[PDB]
């Protein structure tokens, strides 16, 4: 608020002023791979790269 | 190494290599019994890497 001096104070009123803040998002984030049918014959390298993602 | 010897001998400086392909002669194929063998693998698309496909 303004503070403001003296007794007549006549057409000095002020007005009311709040302001704001803007929260938004962004892209998403992701880790997207490929795989052939032949490379989940053993699926540990699968597994592992699903925990190196998270 | 002498145990798997079999040929009388090695291949002398130059003698002559003997061509048996002079004619185009439909084959007549002979073996001894699981001479050939066949390698089969899975296909794993029952992984669940693959979700939209039965």
């Given at each position: 608020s303004p503070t403001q001096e003296g007794?007549?104070?006549?057409?000095?009123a002020t007005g009311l002023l709040e302001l704001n803040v803007a929260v938004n998002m962004g892209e998403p984030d992701n880790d997207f791979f490929q795989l052939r049918?032949?490379?989940?014959?053993?699926?540990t390298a699968y597994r592992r790269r699903i925990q190196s993602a998270a | 190494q002498r145990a798997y010897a079999n040929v009388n001998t090695s291949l002398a400086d130059a003698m002559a290599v003997n061509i048996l392909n002079v004619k185009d002669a439909r084959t007549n194929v002979f073996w001894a019994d699981d001479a050939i063998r066949i390698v089969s693998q899975p296909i794993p698309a029952n992984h669940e890497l693959f979700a939209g496909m039965k």
């Open positions: 007794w007549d104070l006549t057409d000095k049918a032949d490379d989940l014959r053993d699926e | -």
